[PDB]
Amino acid sequence: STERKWAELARRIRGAGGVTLNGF
Amino acid sequence: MAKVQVNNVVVLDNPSPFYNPFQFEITFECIEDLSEDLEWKIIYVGSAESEEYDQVLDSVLVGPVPAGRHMFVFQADAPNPGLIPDADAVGVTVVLITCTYRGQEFIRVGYYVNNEYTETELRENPPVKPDFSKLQRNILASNPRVTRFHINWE
């Protein structure tokens, strides 16, 4: 997969205006 | 400040055939008693290239939640292959678990999802039209991607 596709999937994951961390 | 805290999300029936349902065991702790409902949603990202291809697989209202730890299974039917573009069918995508309280998203758990063929012939030479009945959905349960959002608890 291309970077633009991983970047697109990263954006969908984090949404907008929040703090993202691996785990709870 | 934040009235609801998400303790864990356990991904069940993983891996599974594409057409099989989603299963999630959700644990959350209530710091205070809520007078309104907590809306949970399962959103399949049909296509990385566009938000047009999103599918809300299920939506559940949970409340009035009293103070303390609570748990529930969140089940959802498989996405519609006819809404998923061919180029995004095989490989990696994202499933999302969101929670709102008074129309406001405060939590988003995201998972990377690996949709692949298990058959040697299909994996080596994938068809032009994806055969969804032979795709296995493998969620990346060990990498939960969690995002908290500043909300209004009025």
UniProtKB/Swiss-Prot annotation, chain B:
Effect of residue 108 to E: Reduces interaction with histone H3
Location in or out of the cell: Nucleus; Chromosome
One example of a Gene Ontology biological process annotation: DNA repair-dependent chromatin remodeling
Post-translational modification note: Phosphorylated by TLK1 and TLK2. Highly phosphorylated in S-phase and at lower levels in M-phase.
Keywords tagged on the record: Chaperone, Chromatin regulator, Chromosome, DNA damage, Nucleus, Phosphoprotein, Transcription, Transcription regulation
An example Gene Ontology CC term for this record: chromatin
Region entry Interaction with histone H3, CHAF1B, and HIRA, spans: 1-154
Assembly and oligomerization: Interacts with histone H3 (via C-terminus), including histone H3.1, H3.2 and H3.3, and histone H4; the interaction with H3 is direct. Probably interacts with the heterodimeric form of H3-H4 taking the place of the second dimer. Interacts with the CHAF1A, CHAF1B and RBBP4 subunits of the CAF-1 complex. Interacts with CABIN1, HAT1, HIRA, NASP, TAF1 and UBN1. Found in a soluble complex with NASP and histones H3 and H4; the interaction with NASP is probably indirect and mediated by H3-H4. Interacts with CDAN1. Found in a cytosolic complex with IPO4 and histones H3 and H4. Interacts with CREBBP.
Stated role: Histone chaperone that facilitates histone deposition and histone exchange and removal during nucleosome assembly and disassembly. Cooperates with chromatin assembly factor 1 (CAF-1) to promote replication-dependent chromatin assembly and with HIRA to promote replication-independent chromatin assembly. Promotes homologous recombination-mediated repair of double-strand breaks (DSBs) at stalled or collapsed replication forks: acts by mediating histone replacement at DSBs, leading to recruitment of the MMS22L-TONSL complex and subsequent loading of RAD51.
Recorded family membership: Belongs to the ASF1 family.
Protein's UniProt name: Histone chaperone ASF1A
Organism name: Homo sapiens (Human)
Residue window of the full protein shown: 1 to 154 of 204
